[PDB]
Amino acid sequence: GYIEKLVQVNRVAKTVKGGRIFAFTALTVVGDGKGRVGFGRGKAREVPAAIQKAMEAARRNMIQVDLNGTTLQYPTKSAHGASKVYMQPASEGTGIIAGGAMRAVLEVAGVQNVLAKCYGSTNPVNVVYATFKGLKNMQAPEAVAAKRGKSVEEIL
């Protein structure tokens, strides 16, 4: 589906000769409010056209996320580049408390109780990779129990 959310806008450039050609980039994540997200990056020549391009690439190559219901399954920790990310599920009344670019991922996924923090280099185009290695590699235990459930899930 489609619920859109913008994060970043830049002004990249390019020197040719004579002057300097400008261009705009944008980063936009799209989710469904249930656990299907997708991010997208587009470059164009103006703001109202660079956002439209980044929205279209978001709703291609999406991710199914197996959330527990407004929370996560377990504390995990993933990294990409020089960016390290930590996330652990929380109680009911606590909302989402994260920084800038992990709120926009964790809104549209539908989770509400995420309690996150990012270390290392804060790059909004690169902390998103650090988040999607984490969420796309969840497990959601298909087991008979948890304190007992290590005889039917390990064979899954």
């Binding site: 399954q73 377990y74 504390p75 995990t76 497990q139 235990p141 948890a146 304190k147 459930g149 290590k150 005889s151 899930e153 390990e154 064979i155 899954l156």
Partner: protein, 129 residues
């Protein structure tokens, strides 16, 4: 001159599940032969054999539910030179109770789910997911 044997059993397991091997053979001891019994009962390997006479070996067969293996990570906790000891209150839980943690207690090598039922603390060895 290897200083720690049990961080070498776990290293060969982690490496063989990237070369996509099936059988792994390392030298044995009376502790490694008890750890692999615990990983079998929790279920991460197929079986294990102590089959020699003067250099007794340990032949472990690995599992693959997918192209991805069944063990995804494993690290040694009580490295020789740290010696991590834990009571029952401060005993850790990995992944909200979905991994296993192996604790050498007063009643033998058993997992974290077993000794916490018996209420006996001890010494951590590893945190297998």
């Amino acid at each position: 001159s290897m200083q720690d044997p049990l961080a070498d059993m776990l290293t060969r397991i982690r490496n063989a599940q990237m070369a996509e091997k099936t059988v792994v053979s390392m030298p044995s001891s009376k502790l490694k032969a008890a750890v692999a019994k615990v990983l079998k009962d929790e279920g991460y390997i197929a079986d294990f054999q102590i089959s020699s006479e003067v250099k007794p070996q340990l032949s472990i067969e690995l599992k693959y539910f997918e192209g991805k293996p069944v063990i995804e990570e494993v690290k040694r906790i009580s490295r020789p030179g740290l010696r991590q000891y834990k009571s029952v209150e401060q005993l850790p839980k990995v992944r909200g109770g979905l991994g296993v943690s192996i604790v050498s207690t007063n009643k033998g090598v058993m997992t974290d789910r077993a000794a916490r039922a018996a209420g006996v603390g001890g010494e951590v060895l590893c945190t297998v997911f």
